[PDB]
A paper describes a structure:
To ascertain the architecture of SauUSI, we crystallized the apo-enzyme and determined the structure using X-ray crystallography at a resolution of 3.1 Å. The structure revealed that the single polypeptide protein SauUSI is a dimer and is made of four domains—the N-terminal nuclease domain, followed by a Superfamily 2 (SF2) helicase-like ATPase domain, and an α-helical coupler domain that connects the ATPase to the target recognition domain (TRD). The structure also revealed that the interaction of the nuclease domains of the respective monomers stabilized the dimeric assembly. In the dimeric assembly of SauUSI, the nuclease catalytic site appeared pre-formed by the ‘HxK’ motifs from the two protomers. Three sulfate ions, which possibly mimic the phosphate backbone of a substrate DNA, highlighted the path that the DNA would take on binding to the nuclease domain. The structure of the TRD revealed that it has the fold of an SRA (SET and RING associated) domain, a fold that specializes in recognition of 5-methylcytosine in DNA. The SF2 helicase-like ATPase domain features two RecA-like sub-domains, i.e. 1A and 2A (residues 221–400 and 401–617) and the ATP binding pocket is located in a cleft between them, which in the crystal structure of the apo-enzyme was occupied by a sulfate ion. In the apo-structure of SauUSI, the two ATPases from each monomer are spatially separate and do not interact with each other. We modelled a DNA into the target recognition domain and the SF2 helicase-like ATPase by structurally aligning two close homologs (TRD of SuvH6 and the SF2 helicase-like ATPase of LlaBIII) and noticed that the orientation of the TRD and the SF2 helicase-like ATPase was such that its DNA binding surface faced away from the expected path of the nuclease-bound DNA (as predicted by the position of sulfates). Hence, the apo-structure of SauUSI may be that of an inactive state.
Acquisition of foreign DNA by Staphylococcus aureus, including vancomycin resistance genes, is thwarted by the ATP-dependent endonuclease SauUSI. SauUSI is made of a single polypeptide chain containing three domains - a nuclease domain belonging to the phospholipase D (PLD) family, an ATPase domain belonging to the Superfamily 2 (SF2) of helicase, and a target recognition domain (TRD). The Type IV REase SauUSI cleaves DNA only in the presence of the target sequence 5′-S5mCNGS-3′, where S = G or C and 5mC can be 5-methylcytosine or 5-hydroxymethylcytosine. We show that target recognition activates ATP hydrolysis by the helicase-like ATPase domain, which powers active directional movement (translocation) of SauUSI along the DNA.
Author numbering:
A (entry chain B): 2 to 192, 219 to 347, 352 to 373, 380 to 412, 429 to 668, 680 to 707, 731 to 743, 774 to 799, ...
B (entry chain A): 2 to 192, 221 to 297, 301 to 334, 337 to 345, 353 to 371, 380 to 415, 427 to 511, 514 to 669, ...
The structure:
Amino acid sequence: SRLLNDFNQSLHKGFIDKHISHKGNYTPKLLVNNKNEKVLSTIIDELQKCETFYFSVAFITESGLASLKAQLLDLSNKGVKGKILTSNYLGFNSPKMYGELLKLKNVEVRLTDIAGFHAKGYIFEHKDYSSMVIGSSNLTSNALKVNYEHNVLLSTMKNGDLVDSVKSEFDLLWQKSTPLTEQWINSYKESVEIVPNLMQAEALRSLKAIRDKAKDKALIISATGTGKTILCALDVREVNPNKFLFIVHNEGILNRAKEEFKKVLPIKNDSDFGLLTGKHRDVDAKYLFATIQTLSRDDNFKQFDENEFDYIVFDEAHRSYQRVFNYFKPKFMLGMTATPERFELFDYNIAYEIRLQAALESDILCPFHYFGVTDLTSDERVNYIIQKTDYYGYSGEILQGLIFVSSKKEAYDLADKLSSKGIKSVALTGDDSVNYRQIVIEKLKEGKINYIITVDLFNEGIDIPEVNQVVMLRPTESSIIFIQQLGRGLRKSSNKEYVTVIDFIGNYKTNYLIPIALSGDQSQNKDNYKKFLTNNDSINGVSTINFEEVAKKQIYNSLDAVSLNQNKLILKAYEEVENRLGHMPLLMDFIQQHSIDPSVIFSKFSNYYEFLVRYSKNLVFFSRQIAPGLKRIDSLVLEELLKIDTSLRILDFSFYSNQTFNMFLEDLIELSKYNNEKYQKGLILYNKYSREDFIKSQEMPIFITYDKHEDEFLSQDELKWFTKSNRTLESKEVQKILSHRAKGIKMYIFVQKKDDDGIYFYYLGTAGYIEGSEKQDKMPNGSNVVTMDLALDKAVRDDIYRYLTN
Amino acid sequence: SRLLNDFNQSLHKGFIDKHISHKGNYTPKLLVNNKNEKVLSTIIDELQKCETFYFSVAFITESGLASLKAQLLDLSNKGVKGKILTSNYLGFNSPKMYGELLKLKNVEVRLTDIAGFHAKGYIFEHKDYSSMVIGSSNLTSNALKVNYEHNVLLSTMKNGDLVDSVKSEFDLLWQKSTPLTEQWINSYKESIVPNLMQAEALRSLKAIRDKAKDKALIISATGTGKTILCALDVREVNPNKFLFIVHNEGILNRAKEEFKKVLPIKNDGLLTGKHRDVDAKYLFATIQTLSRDDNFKQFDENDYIVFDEAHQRVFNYFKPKFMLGMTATPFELFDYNIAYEIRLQAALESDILCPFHYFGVTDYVHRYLTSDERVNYIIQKTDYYGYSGEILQGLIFVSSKKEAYDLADKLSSKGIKSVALTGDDSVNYRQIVIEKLKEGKINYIITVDLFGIDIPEVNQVVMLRPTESSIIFIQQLGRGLRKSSNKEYVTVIDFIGNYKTNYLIPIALSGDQSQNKDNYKKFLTNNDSINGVSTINFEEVAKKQIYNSLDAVSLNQNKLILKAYEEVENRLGHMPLLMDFIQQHSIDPSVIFSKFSNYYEFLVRYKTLLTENESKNLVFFSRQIAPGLKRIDSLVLEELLKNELTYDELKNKMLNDIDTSLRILDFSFYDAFTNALSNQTFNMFLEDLIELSKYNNEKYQKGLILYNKYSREDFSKIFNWNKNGSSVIMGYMIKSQEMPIFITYDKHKYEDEFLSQDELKWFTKSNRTLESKEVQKILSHRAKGIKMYIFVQKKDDDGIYFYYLGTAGYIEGSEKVVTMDLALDKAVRDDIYRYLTN
């Protein structure tokens, strides 16, 4: 039985001999640690491919159950049921948490009362074998994603002594635990200096450069629209101005920004911090915080001495509000805005750009759990939406959410429809008055209503920190749009630990765009976005991105049937980049401003110039030759030429208007060097190379396009290798190969996925041969092929393995 | 080679097939805190036999480190060094606990501040292989003995891949972590309900209350937990004329607060001396304030009096409804009616005591015994197993009055403020010195006599005297067992010297009165069933001293049997039958049966009826009834006495296993008895042995029980043999579908040897060879006949009573003196395993 032969090998690698290259995914007995192979990754996998599961976890947090929440639903639609066992030891679990458990209709939950229940055991029963994860990780996003937790993944066959001891232990306290219902829930409810981090200090240095270069009008854009006020205060603290004025368009944000400034700064509360709202006129204060409405009305700005504040901060929705109130002549003018769909006002100087991915690493954003779901007709949609929003739930104690719809007629209708049977449901639109917008905003903030429904008022407006839930009921028009509406929920608040965004996916042509926004991947490779899309969650902090199975296919279909090289998309990207700088930009400005990777420009046009021409050989070669770095032998030696074998190889490769041309060479070579460092440092593992970028003398390069549905992986250490058809199984075709992997030459294995293209071939490392009975022949019909099982020297990573093996 | 074949069988059994047997001890284990198995056992176990350890454990507490402390000290003297990795993830990891980590001489403690350090990784590498314990247990006493935890013990080779990951991960952040030095430590700157035992007690008082007796006493060996038991009985019936009498003054206020907690009504008395409450019908006076100048004439002679051991006597004269008392004494008064006896084991189960960590250490080698060398050794030892709180508030019991004062002077000259306090001290100097410790003005009070002292706050109990008795030991252990705010537990340090009286230490702690030296030695090796947070530890050189004291002394002499009889007779007031020994927790009646033929020959020997015929009847009656093996035999005797029914019509009636009825009858069988019944002494002694049959059986046997000491004769009797043979069975003997095997295990040439927890080597008698007359029978019988029953004794144990460990059978290929490897059907328990394999 191969099942036993596979287990023996794997059991032999995990406990006896690590150098032996096994042929079994069962029980290599791996140690799960949160070092870019997060504990959440393998527990999702074991959940996906299991018939049943029973957990014996002592501590469940709601944010952690959210990470498993979409995987358990897809399991319920598959017919997979499970059990969970917990306790009320130390009063740690909350009723709201216990309520989310009851929503798992396919998960059976009982509550034990053994003293000091601290067990943390997850057990997955497969069809043939079983897997157990035992260790220190609770069911909480800290233990699951970001922590230093020790657990061990043990796979095993159904007759193991360890399994029996565990199952018989579970069934013991399961037989004497009490089940979970709402009736049980009712009984339970009755009974210092802030220092800049990596992103800010990086942002701070850019502002300093603008200051130290003698200018006075800068700008800061935040895609989400958040994370700015604290950045400003850090920057104000360095300059230490005599007087400082902080302009804002929204009054609620104003006071919050003031309190936020107080934290960064040690000065007296009364002396320096003054509000200048409708009801406050602290004009004598050293740090003044004012709405434009009050500064503009009745020339209130006129009573202030011009150029008396050394530092000003507007947020650039307040321009052209009061255009006339730009008259101050301060030492430094700084504006901050949510990124523009379309600054000219601030003399084309961008201090720093806040991107979603960067801000998540910096822990300046509220964590979020994105959830993509299936299926503007009110009746059917409303009831489906209610039951889907109910399942995934909200992060706080009460529901405070903004719903984004496709059109205004839908927004108002949906609100009244939702209003039936308890949903609060009030709609705002571009049509509605300022007073009405403010009133209903206060209503949501005051928890008077749960849902505010809009379509357009997401830009520098309705910025509310308290929102638990962001619902998307519209085709994602743009990445920027998609982010800004995510950004509406990303402000940290007391009521919410995280923010759940529930994204309904329908037959929209633009679903490729929604995985595009979530990653900072301007380079349009459909493989990069499919790889990030599927089980590549080891990058984030505590936030998770989950897709239901059917929704995942919907995005896949949309990304496949849509061209990303469209001439309309590249034209719009050029115009965006032009606005960023007010110039005809070089390819750099597509990088520094994160718009379009120049490798995407070349896929449609052989030159940037030719694209300019719609609205040669030197350009196409010089980019292509240098656009990737490739060890920098060319980068440094051709730099010397501009003004040991690998060196030689670089010379042979280069051999084998005009002033405008020199300038244009500069952008391409500069991109070359930047591209080099960011992607190739100074032959890098788990990277992508193309045959050109790469059996010879001391070279045996294998390039596979994995198509198992043929070469197939047997474990993380072995795969089956086919030669060409009609290969001799003897003499030159095989005896050269059977010698190479045996002795002398080393193999270089490259694996593509069948959807991918030429410039993209993963590199997995080196290999050899099993040397034992890796012989074969062909089918009766065809031309003699040879199959051999090779032994990888470096085992393949989890996330790489899971994406290649579907 | 041999290692791998053993290993693969263990991998196979753990991970592939639970039903095969295996050689070696490498099967993965599920560590849970069971009331039969605990994680600490296995952690200690892996510690003892390893070369080097390194723990990657997030949370460590003082109370857990004390358990590893004694073991880690032994490891230190063997040249074994370890590593410990810890982090202050949740911010508290108390600074003192970090001082205790510094004490660990053979442990490199490092400190990482990586985010959320939550791992619990215990790795033990022996020279041949490695062990890994991974799960949810922290280095805390609750994670290692109480809480329901989940750990997996994994044995592995040095080249296993799983250990590569764990070792390489540990090395990564060991280099990134900062070493635990004292400078860094100092640098740190940051900012009503009745127990289940009660039910037993107030049941006894209620039973006494049903009768006309108005006097009863409860015995507390430690002398604690007395307050909340009385007040619970005072609440049952409220005499509304209540008066509380004690000899200690600091206890008066404590006892008054406790009684005020159980009773909910208002406050409105105590007259501690120049005090003036004297009313409200709730008194809390002392004997001295009453005894001085006759102050009992203030109230009528005529309802809930309760006293003390040392509590003038003319003030005991006046009559009330329900007088009582509470003592810790080795009463004669109170109509000789003892209500309940609080013993150590029971009292620790109801959590009325305080947790304790005993530490048996070796006294210094080479005043008479208060030199510079013995002083500096006691210092470096009490420092090691340090105190459980934050300030040291301990007691020290030495052996002579002269030692107490001289040691106090020498101890205090080293910076450890100590004061002696012997019986020839004044009463006011005691109260000045006692309240000097309660206020933390000093750290120690050395004594010989006063075990006066009644301070709850005591951290340490140091013992520098031979254990005089079993009673004295527990009493001066009870000076810490009271609960207090300053302390989490009581560390107790007993200095084991050359004294011959060390054998009493396991006798006092276990509570096992059946003085069998195997039962005690078992309590030395592994007490994995001692529920609660508390632990008992012996240094290796100290544990052998207790073993020597057990071997070198006998527990049988006729003077001790007589002493116990006089002790029971003084607790009873009458002459004790055999049920009075057990009911008072005196020596098990088997201890009387070992030297004297029966209880009648004992009573006459130390000051009869139908002597010769009655004596033989009593000796057999002991055999049949006293062990309590096989209830039906005892019940059949009762039916014959009363039912007197018609042959096997009665015998059948019993069924509402008939072979078992028949051998009960055989045992009794194989006219004069009515004449023996006509005697009143014989009928009286019968009514005692029969009840002794019932009690022994019900408990020990009615609850062939596994992992029990069983006798050749006892097995033959249990299994309805005609023979009831004892001499007939040897190492191997086989009946019809039986073949029990009895082995005296003593590994250290070719002998019976345990190969794993389910597979040993059997050896036949006297080089009988090959496929002989009996071997082939044994092989065919295992294959097609007897279920092989097996019993294991230790080399030291003498009784024919061997531990039963299930059934076994000849492994097929094992047939290679006849030597064969057999497979047990139930793997032998860990405590039994450790004790049987020494």
